[PDB]
Amino acid sequence: MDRDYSTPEDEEELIRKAIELSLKESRNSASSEPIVPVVESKNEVKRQEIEEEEDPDLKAAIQESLREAEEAKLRSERQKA
Incomplete structure (x- = not known):
């Protein structure tokens, strides 16, 4: 290319x-x-059921049951044995 000052390359x-x-x-x-x-996922699942304890329904049931029975027996008064 130069053809004067020596070609590069x-x-x-x-x-x-x-x-x-x-x-x-x-x-x-x-x-x-x-x-x-x-x-992209969410869940709050977890085992428990550590006993209810002091069940309110149970107490209420016992009281109402004994009271009803008392009234029925009181009215009759009569008993075979």
Whole structure:
């Protein structure tokens, strides 16, 4: 190409190539956005039933039952045995 100051394509070519490439070359972000939530599920299930304890219905039932029986027996008064 030069045809006067010796044709390149040698040491000179390498130097130019290295310089240009080095200057252009750098990091490599190319956009970034990793990490992403994946909580597409929710449940509050859990075993328990640690005994009700002091059942109110039970007490109420006993009282009403004994009272009713008392009234019935009181009215009759008579008993075979």
